[PDB]
């Protein structure tokens, strides 16, 4: 039943006023600074870019390590194969030479027995010669 | 975020990759000669994401075809859309990987890798705004698995700020090409955990079970399995290929889907499930489409989603349907099944509706879930790996390539830590 | 003159900008080519500059870290209205990551944006300040805006900066990380903004569904409604009005405390264009509708809060006698609790310019309309809902690696959340006796 | 270009080589002069004149057997330089083949292989064909294998070994030559396909109704199996398996490299109407012991790997359906540590038969290669015959006379004991 | 392994040698002039083993004819095939050895030896691939025994890597030329044990008993005995003379037949038994052949094979017969009579079938056994030697030629050790 109407403004395309139903129960009006700065903003944007760049480089360093390992396993397979060859080559030459050695030894032993049979024969022949002619 | 560069490695990678290219070409109205014959502008609005515009007219897939064997490469060229591919983009070695990850990753693979990088660099240098890479491969073989992960690592080094996405096919004893699959898969998972941003876990175990049990096949072929894959690949790439607000690019998809860097293995889902000869059915409503979300039977990974909790979910509806009906049917599923969604990731399920349905279907739904239940897939590969590794079975074929036993121990330890990490979040309360 | 520079950041900011400028040209008789039949207002010069060819060019800059959305402006109906140099785009977006918008990408286009704003400020004889339009949710709307606001405080020290901020709603949301981006931008922008008009996408979505019978509201639906409220707020800057006649007058009338600068907008009437008969709604009915939480632009309960300032902005066929009678009746039936240090009252402004609607739009043309701007402590409920979603995810450090990967420190999340806690404590303390 | 070098050592190796190359020519349409009215290039090189020459070397310490090649139908198919012969044979003595006689021709053989490897752009490795029994097949092969490991390191070397049978045997010392060659070759071979002459003799009698099987009968059947293994390398089929794949899928441990071959179907060129057996029937026949190439009982052993090589009118679906039923068979035990065990090869070309031969033309055939612990029974039988003679040092003087030492016999037998112990250990759980 | 060089020494050596040459010439279609008049190209395939191609169409035996007396060799030139031999190959003395081993080994023999070596070197150096030597001689006389073993030793020295094979005829009191035969035989056995690789033990005792008991010849002559020898020699050389897989050369035969160096004394056997010119009315069956060939009565050594055990056996079947039947009969004999085959030499019996039968017979069988029963032959010579040696009877016949008693003691001791060695293997168990 009360209401206070305080006129504010009046223009060509409008009118304004204030309506007050009740004054403020409490009195004494309502009872900023940054600013910021371009340097501060740049510093934070740059710090963030460096965090982004550091991590991209870290992933890259990890990918580079996998690449080195890839070369290492290829190299490992090369080394195992060369060694295989080396061992097979020496195992064989030792075998071929040992067999040559045993085979020539066997043929020498048998040829020596036949040779001794020849010595024994001229010896037997010497005995007959001493029995024959003498007394005869 | 415009261009995606697609890479296909090995037999599986190229068979599923060829299938993807023929399915999306049909959706974008591109014939097997590269010319556009479609009746709509939505088909061409984001054509640039997967295709290059050739010298006057025609559209050529931004696809690189890779194998250590020439066979599969001939099979693709001879296939339905075989002639659509850039001939210079076919990169093939002469001697395969012999189903050996070590040969694909360190020997034969390492010898062909730079030729592949040269072809990917030419496609990448041509891009106005490269999103990243999409790789299709199997984890059980030698090339797709070993060389594929070698490519991921080499690509990561040259393009560290680009998104690395894969369609990775998990082996299963039910459908196997080789005795050493648990080894090749474990060694690959280790690579994917460290080097990819997003991986769609395509499990041959789940694909087999769907064909046998649900499609009532009997004895299923790669053709049967690849029909489910092509539907899944078309579904999961819809948001990248057509105008939309949700997961419209590789990075925005990763931001919504991956809460922790290592937990980037998605369990894709699809409805309706159909067979190549099954054509014509007519049915499936908005409620029926949404009901498959928690249906273990509709998962392309052999995991039961009700055995874990969803970290994040992307749901894509295709065809002419009410967005009102979709939104409320999606809200109901979440409220009714609140125990399978982590409470500490609010509004973790995102929905998109594309007007263009896939060929054969009037209405369809594709689900992309980052579920803690995916640990079941990794546990299965780990148990198969351990049964072989305990006895050092077939190990000499890997050590013969210069690998150490330690690499095997490290790979499996990393896969077990990943299992422990999903388990940690499955048990997290928040609260 | 008393010129105002409008800045539209990210998709939401740019898209709402399209809706606002389409409506402004609709209110001033400016054709989409910038042509306007000369006829004996001339306050419209605060928002539009003039060229040697007689064309009226908006005093605005449109920014996005991606070209798709702005390319539609460059190609669309209003392409001749803006000069190419005031439409700024990068190549790659901020991917819903505040860190990406603020620290990584933003840093590449900031100087270009500042240079363009400086060129617009040079054409001003009495620059009042800036109106900044953006989403809280997106990486550009959040990250790029806070970067822009900090620089503007450096380059324009004193000059007023007001915001139109899109508060996220899950029904239209594109990212799970929207609460993170919301808190980070609020913390960083807090000391650089003088007055911010938050627009809760759920409140708009709900007004569009109820009042406009739109089953599934689109961005066009939402933006056209938002544009009506912006038009009500800016009308006395663009016409020879009597209340909120300059930017400084927004802080004076609505903002008794620097941090407590988030007024609540309530608009009435919102009527479907395909209704029938009707009406016409009186000054009493539209005034009563100002005290209805359903018509608010932010979801909150003023019954649970206290008013520290209230403005009623009428438009069209409105008489002071009807207004005072309408206020008198409300005081009888409702409490309208003000804080002890403020008088229970209203600063009222009538702008005789009629409410304007977009020709084939969803809104009906009305003879009378009103926007109430009130600084209520109830708006803290909107911050509380946002803070809670932040806390749930932050407790597990969910998605944090995306921000850290961009060079942002985890400590920034703690700093931002602590500032929000102080803001919540400030609203509590302000309404005590 | 994925080339494979075939080496044929001694009579058995050379004679099986004749049967294989006659069949390969028939399969690829190559006339006996090398002319032709692609994959075969892995086994045949080409001359500027358009002639197709086998990537093979034939070796024997005596000229008789190879002189028949130089005089026969396929004279001109081979260049004279790839047909190497000495004057005196190894007289059924491993020691003469390895040292005494072998050392005279070894460098010549290596030089010719080097010249063949020189024409290869992507050499896969070597296929070595020989018997266990003869002095050349045993002694010269062992020497060749050691030298190939020196010249080519770890390049793949696979064998087709003729396991001795008393019914066709020529020497009492065959178990000694068998053990000596197995010991010496063990570390140099990657994968060996043993062919038990008694199993072949019994298939020829049973399945082919041949009263008294001859080497021609045996070799034609053997050639069929060998052609199945090389079919994947010589053709581009529905599913291929290269030399590397054979090794990876069939061998779990370096020493355990002896897969069991089983071929089906073997039907006489006279009769039905056999009823074009289905992929299932031919697959099932692979796990039945009568069709095996080595006499042993896989029901008493455990499988570690199975490679199934299909040829002719065969579809992947039929194969997987047939394998799925094998997976349900409780009676077919696989080891603990093998989550799967299967590897499939499919080729378009049905098995071609020699005009005038004993084998009937079939629409589909299969060769299964399985690594079973049951194959250790074949080593046990050989070891036992070795032990009986060695306990008395019977015939040992023949080897010692050639420069060998009794220590070698002991070393060789101990390696065989470890091989037997290895098959035992690998099969436990 | 092509050429064999044949040597025939002394009376017995030349009589049996002449007989061998006439028998094999008929089998190879060579007439007494050296010209080939046969057919069945099998006759010429391995003609090089025993004959030289004489510039012209002639075939000349690679035979050296040796004696210390002209008698037998004038008798050879005058014999049936006498003119087929190379005239320069006849090496003869005028002295004789007087049935004294010392005269043949040390005196008269040593004086003619170099002339013989002259002729053997010429034949040997002409060879493309020399197998070795075949000597025919008696052990009871002086030339064949003493000079023959001297030749073996001289040839062994010059050709140590060649095979040394002999057809050695053992003396018997039933046939007897002297009292000194036990001495000459013991001294020769000593030489053969040390210097030969393979010896066919042709026992005059057994030959006499066959002629007297089986052939019913009241007073057998050397002609009767030599008919059994020529049949045996033709039979045991079949595998060397015709194309075949089994024991096709001298070294391969020794490898299959000799398990211990000293145990190289073969017990030859034959079926069927016939007298001279007498033919035929009834040809034996395969089952008959395989029984007879393993019977005492059919042995060319006076030993009962059922008194010992077979170390190794080579069985040769001649004539048109079923290989199936032969194989089946040969396996049956071994299973039925397993106690006469050592268990510790598996598959110790080898079988061969030659289509060409010997003249007069439609079907025949030859048995080459390395049996521990041969110790009975050596025990018999040893008992006769000891009866004389104990009394030093006729010893001055040998000491007069320069020999010492020690040589007798050594020879005797070596022959008794050989007996003990066969006994050791006879008693050896597999276990
Ligand atoms: N009212 C309204 N809200 C919008 C509009 N476009 C986007 N939004 C909201 O704003 C948030 C998405 O942020 P955007 O402005 O699209 O993204 P942005 O500023 O371009 O930043 P980035 O795309 O991440 O570089 C979600 O809450 C959307 O619902 C629009 O046109 N109107
Ligand atoms: N399957 C088959 N086995 C054979 C053939 N020839 C010989 N054998 C077997 O191989 C063994 C004989 O060894 P061979 O290969 O003939 O002799 P070699 O390698 O020439 O050695 P030497 O003749 O002693 O120099 C016995 O087991 C025979 O049965 C053949 O053509 N086919
Ligand atoms: N879904 C599916 N899986 C396949 C296909 N081809 C092969 N695989 C699987 O892929 C793995 C073998 O990898 P593969 O690509 O053939 O070897 P790679 O060529 O060396 O990469 C096994 O798990 C096979 O089951 C295919 O076309 N579709
Ligand atoms: N079977 C056979 N034995 C003979 C023949 N001539 C002599 N003998 C035996 O040979 C031994 C005598 O040897 P002999 O060759 O006559 O003396 P040599 O000429 O000095 O060597 C005695 O055992 C005789 O029985 C013969 O033609 N055939
Ligand atoms: Mg945007
Ligand atoms: Mg041979």
From the list A110, A113, A127, the residue facing E402 with the nearest CB is A127
CA–CA gap between residue B62 and residue B5 (Å, rounded)? 6
What's the fold here for domain C1-263?
Rossmann fold (3.40.50)
| Nearest residue to D370 via CA among B173, B386, B179 | B179
Please check whether residue A57 touches B, CB under 8 A: no
What are the binding residues of E for Mg(2+)? 67, 69
Rounded to the nearest angstrom, the distance between the alpha carbon of B114 and the centre of ligand 6 is: 52
Taking an 8 Å cut-off on Cβ atoms, the answer to whether B255 and C393 are in contact is: no
Please say whether the beta carbons of B192 and B150 come within 8 A. no
Task: Measure Cα distances from B218 to B203, B230, B279, D332 in Å.
Answer: 19, 21, 18, 22
What is the distance in angstroms between the Cα of A107 and the nearest Cα belonging to chain D? 9
CA–CA gap between residue D316 and residue D347 (Å, rounded)? 11
The CA-based angle D374-D380-D382, given to 5 degrees, is 125
CB atoms within 10 A of CB C312: 24
CA–CA gap between residue C89 and residue C65 (Å, rounded)? 5
Please say whether the beta carbons of E273 and E63 come within 8 A. no
What is the distance in angstroms between the Cα of B238 and the nearest Cα belonging to chain C? 16
Question: How many Cβ contacts (< 8 angstroms) between chains A and B?
Answer: 35
Please say whether the beta carbons of B165 and B198 come within 8 A. yes
Q: Which of D106, D148, D153, D411 to mutate to test the interface with A (most CBs of A within 10 A)?
A: D153
Task: Measure Cα distances from D306 to C24, D237, D316, D365, D371 in Å.
Answer: 80, 19, 16, 16, 7
The CA-based angle C377-C383-C387, given to 5 degrees, is 145
CA–CA gap between residue D254 and residue D189 (Å, rounded)? 9
User: Is residue A44 packed enough to be buried (19+ CB in 10 Å), middle (13-18) or exposed (0-12)?
Assistant: middle
Ligand nearest D168 Cα, by number?
A: 2
Q: Which residue carries 């081979």 as its tokens?
A: D78
DSSP string, B117-182: HHHHHHHHHT-SSEEEEEEEEESSSSIIIIIHHHHHHHHHHH-TTSEEEEEEEEP-GGG-S-TTHH
CA–CA gap between residue C178 and residue C167 (Å, rounded)? 9
Please say whether the beta carbons of D40 and D91 come within 8 A. no
Beta D364-372 vs D260-264: how paired, if at all?
antiparallel
| Solving technique | X-ray
**Domain D1-259 architecture:** 3-Layer(aba) Sandwich (3.40)
In the sheet where D125-131 sits, what is the strand order? Answer: D83-85, D56-60, D4-9, D125-131, D156-163, D191-196
CA–CA gap between residue E175 and residue E178 (Å, rounded)? 10
CA–CA gap between residue E431 and residue E429 (Å, rounded)? 6
| Nearest residue to C60 via CA among C234, C313, C236 | C234
CA–CA gap between residue E326 and residue E332 (Å, rounded)? 10
User: Is residue B426 packed enough to be buried (19+ CB in 10 Å), middle (13-18) or exposed (0-12)?
Assistant: middle
Establish whether residue D358 lines the binding site of ligand 2, counting it when its CB lies within 6 angstroms of any ligand atom. no
Q: How many residues does chain E have?
A: 431
| Nearest residue to C112 via CA among C182, C64, C178, C59 | C64
Beta C344-351 vs C307-316: how paired, if at all?
parallel
Whether A contacts B, i.e. 3 or more CB pairs less than 8 A apart, is yes
| Residue D129 φ then ψ, to 5° | -105, 125
Please check whether residue A94 touches D, CB under 8 A: no
Query: Would you say residue A52 lies in a domain?
Result: yes
Beta E51-54 vs E58-61: how paired, if at all?
antiparallel
Beta C307-316 vs C368-376: how paired, if at all?
antiparallel
Task: Please report which residue ranges of E337-404 form alpha helices under DSSP H.
Answer: 375-389, 396-399
Q: Which residue carries 């299959």 as its tokens?
A: E256
What are the binding residues of B for GTP? 11-12, 97-99, 138, 142-144, 181, 204, 222, 226
Please say whether the beta carbons of B120 and B7 come within 8 A. yes
Residue B256, token pair as written in the block: 């919504």
CATH code: domain C264-378 is 3.30.1330.20
Q: What's D204's DSSP letter?
A: H
Taking an 8 Å cut-off on Cβ atoms, the answer to whether B402 and A80 are in contact is: yes
Please say whether the beta carbons of A19 and C346 come within 8 A. yes
Task: Please report which residue ranges of B28-100 form alpha helices under DSSP H.
Answer: 42-45, 71-77
Taking an 8 Å cut-off on Cβ atoms, the answer to whether A99 and D404 are in contact is: yes
For C322, the 3-state DSSP assignment is helix
Task: Measure Cα distances from E7 to E73, E134, E135, E142, E147 in Å.
Answer: 13, 6, 5, 16, 11
Cis amide prior to B75 (ω within 30 degrees): no
Whether C contacts B, i.e. 3 or more CB pairs less than 8 A apart, is yes
Nominal resolution (angstroms): 2.4
Taking an 8 Å cut-off on Cβ atoms, the answer to whether C407 and A20 are in contact is: no
Residue nearest to ligand 3 atom 4, measured at CA: B12
Please say whether the beta carbons of B161 and B168 come within 8 A. no
> Hey, what long-range contacts does C57-60 have (CB within 8 A, 24 or more apart)?
C57/C81, C57/C82, C57/C83, C58/C6, C58/C21, C58/C24, C58/C82, C58/C86, C59/C3, C59/C4, C59/C5, C59/C6, C59/C120, C59/C123, C59/C124, C60/C5, C60/C6, C60/C7, C60/C8, C60/C17, C60/C21, C60/C86, C60/C120
DSSP string, A22-72: E--SS-SS--------HHHHHHHHHHHHHHHHHHHHHHHHHHHHHHHHHHH
CA–CA gap between residue D328 and residue B54 (Å, rounded)? 54
What is the distance in angstroms between the Cα of C292 and the nearest Cα belonging to chain B? 26
Please check whether residue A136 touches C, CB under 8 A: no
For E409, the 3-state DSSP assignment is helix
Query: Would you say residue A51 lies in a domain?
Result: yes
Q: Contacts of residue E246 in chain D, CB cutoff 8 Å?
A: 170
Rounded to the nearest angstrom, the distance between the alpha carbon of E204 and the centre of ligand 4 is: 9
Q: What's B68's DSSP letter?
A: S
| Cβ within 8 Å of residue E331, ≥6 positions away | none
Beta D44-46 vs D83-85: how paired, if at all?
unpaired
Residue C80, token pair as written in the block: 């001749």
CA–CA gap between residue D22 and residue D223 (Å, rounded)? 9
| Nearest residue to A56 via CA among D321, C292, B158 | B158
Number of domains in chain A: 1
Rounded to the nearest angstrom, the distance between the alpha carbon of C422 and the centre of ligand 2 is: 97
Return the bridge partners of C167, or none.
C200
Q: Which atom of ligand 3 is nearest to the CA of B96?
A: 20
Q: Which residue carries 């609709």 as its tokens?
A: C26
Taking an 8 Å cut-off on Cβ atoms, the answer to whether E259 and D211 are in contact is: no
Beta E4-9 vs E310-319: how paired, if at all?
unpaired
Helix count and strand count (H, E) for chain C:
15, 12
Task: Please report which residue ranges of C104-255 form alpha helices under DSSP H.
Answer: 106-122, 139, 145-155, 178-189, 201-209, 219-238, 248-254
Establish whether residue D92 lines the binding site of ligand 2, counting it when its CB lies within 6 angstroms of any ligand atom. yes
> What is the Cα Rg of chain C in Å?
21
CA–CA gap between residue C111 and residue A36 (Å, rounded)? 17
Write down the catalytic residue from C249, C406, C409, C429: C249
Q: Which residues line ligand 1 (CB under 6 A)?
A: C 10-12, 15-16, 64-65, 93-96, 101, 135, 137-141, 166, 168, 172-174, 178, 201, 219, 222-223, 226
Instruction: Establish whether D245 is a catalytic residue.
Output: yes
CA–CA gap between residue D22 and residue D14 (Å, rounded)? 12
CB atoms within 10 A of CB D320: 19
Taking an 8 Å cut-off on Cβ atoms, the answer to whether B402 and A59 are in contact is: no
CA–CA gap between residue E70 and residue B373 (Å, rounded)? 110
Q: Which atom of ligand 3 is nearest to the CA of B181?
A: 23
Residue B231, token pair as written in the block: 């539907």
CATH code: domain D375-429 is 1.10.287.600
Establish whether residue D374 lines the binding site of ligand 2, counting it when its CB lies within 6 angstroms of any ligand atom. no
User: Is residue D38 packed enough to be buried (19+ CB in 10 Å), middle (13-18) or exposed (0-12)?
Assistant: exposed
Quote the strand ranges of B34-94, DSSP E.
51-53, 59-61, 63-67, 90-92
Ligand nearest E92 Cα, by number?
A: 4
| Cβ within 8 Å of residue E333, ≥6 positions away | E290, E291, E294
CA–CA gap between residue B314 and residue B318 (Å, rounded)? 13
Q: Which domains does chain B have, with CATH numbers?
A: 1-259 (3.40.50.1440), 260-373 (3.30.1330.20), 374-431 (1.10.287.600)
Please say whether the beta carbons of D250 and D423 come within 8 A. no
DSSP string, B363-426: EEEEEEEEEGGGHHHHHHHHHHHHHHHTTTTTTHHHHTTT--HHHHHHHHHHHHHHHHHHHHHH
Residue nearest to ligand 3 atom 25, measured at CA: B176
Please say whether the beta carbons of A125 and E400 come within 8 A. no
Q: Which residue carries 């730079």 as its tokens?
A: B114
> Domain C379-433 has what CATH class?
mainly alpha
For D346, the 3-state DSSP assignment is strand
Residue of E103, E106, E138, E170 with the most ligand 4 atoms within 8 Å of its CB, for mutation:
E138
Among C residues 29-58, those touching chain A with beta carbons less than 8 Å apart: 41, 43
Please check whether residue A70 touches D, CB under 8 A: no
Chains that touch E (3 or more CB pairs under 8 A): A, D
CA–CA gap between residue E140 and residue E204 (Å, rounded)? 10
CA–CA gap between residue B284 and residue B246 (Å, rounded)? 24
Beta C195-200 vs C160-167: how paired, if at all?
parallel
Rounded to the nearest angstrom, the distance between the alpha carbon of C18 and the centre of ligand 3 is: 52
Please say whether the beta carbons of B213 and B174 come within 8 A. no
| Nearest residue to B296 via CA among B259, B271, B313 | B271
Q: What's E48's DSSP letter?
A: G
Taking an 8 Å cut-off on Cβ atoms, the answer to whether B98 and D248 are in contact is: yes
Residue of D162, D197, D382 with the most ligand 2 atoms within 8 Å of its CB, for mutation:
D162
Taking an 8 Å cut-off on Cβ atoms, the answer to whether A126 and E110 are in contact is: no
Q: What's E4's DSSP letter?
A: E
Please say whether the beta carbons of C300 and C234 come within 8 A. no
The domain spans of chain C are 1-263, 264-378, 379-433
Query: Would you say residue A10 lies in a domain?
Result: no
Task: Please report which residue ranges of E159-269 form alpha helices under DSSP H.
Answer: 181-195, 204-209, 222-241, 250-257
Residue A56 belongs to domain with CATH number: 6.10.280.30
| Cβ within 8 Å of residue E268, ≥6 positions away | E200, E201, E202, E232, E235, E236, E299, E300, E301, E366, E367, E368, E369
Please say whether the beta carbons of E338 and E306 come within 8 A. no
Quote the strand ranges of C352-427, DSSP E.
368-376
Q: Contacts of residue A47 in chain C, CB cutoff 8 Å?
A: 407
Taking an 8 Å cut-off on Cβ atoms, the answer to whether D147 and A92 are in contact is: yes
For B320, the 3-state DSSP assignment is coil
Q: Which domain holds residue A50?
A: 32-136
Please say whether the beta carbons of D211 and D169 come within 8 A. no
Write down the catalytic residue from D245, D281, D411, D420: D245
For C73, the 3-state DSSP assignment is helix
CA–CA gap between residue E310 and residue E349 (Å, rounded)? 9
| Residue B94 φ then ψ, to 5° | -110, -30
Q: What's A9's DSSP letter?
A: E
Please check whether residue A126 touches E, CB under 8 A: yes
Task: Measure Cα distances from B45 to B49, B63, B131, E345 in Å.
Answer: 9, 19, 17, 88
| Cβ within 8 Å of residue B127, ≥6 positions away | B2, B3, B5
Q: What's C296's DSSP letter?
A: B
Q: Contacts of residue E403 in chain A, CB cutoff 8 Å?
A: 124, 127
User: Is residue B392 packed enough to be buried (19+ CB in 10 Å), middle (13-18) or exposed (0-12)?
Assistant: middle
Taking an 8 Å cut-off on Cβ atoms, the answer to whether B344 and C395 are in contact is: yes
Buried b (16+ CB within 10 A) or exposed e, E121-147: eebbeebeebbbbbbbbbbbbbbbbbb
> Domain D260-374 has what CATH class?
alpha beta
């Amino acid at each position: 039943a009360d209401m206070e109407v305080i006129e504010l403004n009046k223009a060509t395309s409008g009118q304004s006023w204030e309506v007050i139903l009740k004054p403020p129960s409490f009195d004494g009006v309502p009872e900023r600074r940054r600013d910021p700065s371009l340097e501060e903003i740049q510093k934070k944007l740059e710090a963030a870019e460096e965090r982004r760049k550091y991590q991209e480089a870290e992933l890259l360093k990890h990918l580079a390590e996998k690449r080195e390992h890839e070369r290492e396993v290829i190299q490992k397979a090369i080394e195992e194969n060369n060694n295989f060859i080396k061992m097979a080559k020496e195992k064989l030459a030792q075998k071929m030479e040992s067999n040559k050695e045993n085979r020539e030894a066997h043929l020498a032993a048998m040829l020596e027995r036949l040779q001794e049979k020849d010595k024994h024969a001229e010896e037997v022949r010497k005995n007959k010669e001493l029995k024959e002619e003498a007394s005869r | 975020m415009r261009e995606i560069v697609h890479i296909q490695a090995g037999q599986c990678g190229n068979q599923i990759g060829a299938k993807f290219w023929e399915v999306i070409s049909d959706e974008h109205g591109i014939d097997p000669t590269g010319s556009y014959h479609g009746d709509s502008d939505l088909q061409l609005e984001r054509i640039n994401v997967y295709y290059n515009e050739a010298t006057g007219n025609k559209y050529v897939p931004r696809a690189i075809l890779v194998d250590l064997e020439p066979g599969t490469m001939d099979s693709v060229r001879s296939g339905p859309f075989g002639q659509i591919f850039r001939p210079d983009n076919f990169v093939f070695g002469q001697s395969g990987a012999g189903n050996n990850w070590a040969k694909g990753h360190y020997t034969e693979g390492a010898e062909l890798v730079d030729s592949v990088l040269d072809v990917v660099r030419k496609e990448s240098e041509s891009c106005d705004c490269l999103q990243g890479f999409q790789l299709t491969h199997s984890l059980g073989g030698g090339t797709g698995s070993g060389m594929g992960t070698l490519l991921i690592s080499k690509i990561r080094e040259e393009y560290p700020d680009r998104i690395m996405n894969t369609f990775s096919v998990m082996p299963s004893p039910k459908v196997s090409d080789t005795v050493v699959e648990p080894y090749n898969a474990t060694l690959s998972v280790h690579q994917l955990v460290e080097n990819t941003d997003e991986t769609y876990s395509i499990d041959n175990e789940a694909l087999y079970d769907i064909c046998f049990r649900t499609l009532k096949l009997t004895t299923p072929t790669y053709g049967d399995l690849n029909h489910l894959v092509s539907a899944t690949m078309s579904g999961v790439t819809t948001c990248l290929r057509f105008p939309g607000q949700l997961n419209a690019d590789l990075r925005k998809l990763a931001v919504n889907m991956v809460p922790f860097p290592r937990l980037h293995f998605f369990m894709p889902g699809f409805a309706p499930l159909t067979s190549r000869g099954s054509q014509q059915y007519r049915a499936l409503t908005v409620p029926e489409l949404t009901q498959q979300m928690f249906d273990s039977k509709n998962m392309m990974a052999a995991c039961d989603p009700r055995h874990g909790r969803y970290l994040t979910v992307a749901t894509i509806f295709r065809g002419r349907m009410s967005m009102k009906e979709v939104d409320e049917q999606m809200l109901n599923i979440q409220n009714k099944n609140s125990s399978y969604f982590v409470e500490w990731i609010p509004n973790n399920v995102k929905t998109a509706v594309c007007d263009i349905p896939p060929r054969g279907l009037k209405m369809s739904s594709t689900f992309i879930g980052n579920s803690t239940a995916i640990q079941e897939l990794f546990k299965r590969i780990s148990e198969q790996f351990t049964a072989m590794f305990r006895r050092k079975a077939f190990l000499h074929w890997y050590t013969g390539e210069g690998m150490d036993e330690m690499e095997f121990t490290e790979a499996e330890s990393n896969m077990n830590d990943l299992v422990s990490e999903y388990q940690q979040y499955q048990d997290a309360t928040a609260d | 003159m008393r010129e105002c520079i409008s800045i539209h950041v990210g998709q939401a900011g740019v898209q709402i900008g399209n809706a606002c400028w389409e409506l402004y040209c609709l209110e001033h008789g400016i054709q989409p080519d910038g042509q306007m039949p000369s006829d004996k207002d001339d306050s419209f010069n605060t928002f539009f500059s003039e060229t040697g060819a007689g064309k009226h060019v908006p005093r605005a800059v449109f920014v996005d870290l991606e070209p798709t959305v702005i390319d539609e402006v460059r190609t669309g109906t209003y392409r001749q209205l803006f000069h190419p140099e005031q439409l700024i785009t990068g190549k790659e977006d901020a991917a819903n990551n505040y860190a990406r918008g603020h620290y990584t990408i933003g840093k590449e286009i900031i100087d270009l944006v500042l240079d363009r704003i400086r060129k617009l400020a040079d054409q001003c004889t009495g620059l009042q300040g800036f109106l900044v339009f953006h989403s809280f949710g997106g990486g550009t709307g959040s990250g790029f805006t806070s970067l822009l606001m900090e620089r503007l405080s450096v380059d324009y020290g004193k000059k007023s900066k007001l915001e139109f901020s899109i508060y996220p709603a899950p029904q239209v949301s594109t990212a799970v990380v929207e609460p993170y981006n919301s808190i980070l931008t609020t913390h960083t922008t807090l000391e650089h903004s003088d007055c911010a008009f938050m627009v809760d996408n759920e409140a708009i979505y709900d007004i569009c569904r109820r009042n406009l019978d739109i089953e599934r509201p689109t961005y066009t639906n939402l933006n056209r409604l938002i544009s009506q409220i912006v038009s009500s707020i800016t009308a006395s800057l663009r016409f020879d009005g009597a209340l909120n006649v300059d930017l400084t007058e927004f802080q004076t009338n609505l903002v008794p405390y620097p941090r407590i600068h988030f007024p609540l907008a309530t608009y009435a009437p919102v009527i479907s264009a395909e209704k029938a008969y009707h009406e016409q709604l009186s000054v009493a009915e539209i005034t009563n509708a100002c005290f209805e939480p359903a018509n608010q632009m932010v979801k909150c309960d003023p019954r649970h809060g206290k008013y520290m300032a209230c403005c009623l902005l009428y438009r069209g066929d409105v008489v002071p006698k009807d207004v005072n009678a309408a206020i008198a009746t409300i005081k009888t039936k409702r409490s309208i609790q003000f804080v002890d240090w403020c008088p229970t009252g209203f600063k009222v402004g009538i702008n005789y310019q009629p409410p304007t609607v977009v020709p084939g739009g969803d809104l009906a043309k009305v003879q009378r309309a009103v926007c109430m701007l009130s600084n209520t402590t109830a708006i803290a409920e909107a911050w509380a809902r946002l803070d809670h979603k932040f806390d749930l995810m932050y407790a597990k450090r969910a998605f944090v690696h995306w921000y850290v990967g961009e060079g942002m420190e985890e400590g920034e999340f703690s700093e931002a959340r602590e500032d929000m806690a102080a803001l919540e404590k400030d609203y509590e303390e302000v309404g005590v006796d």
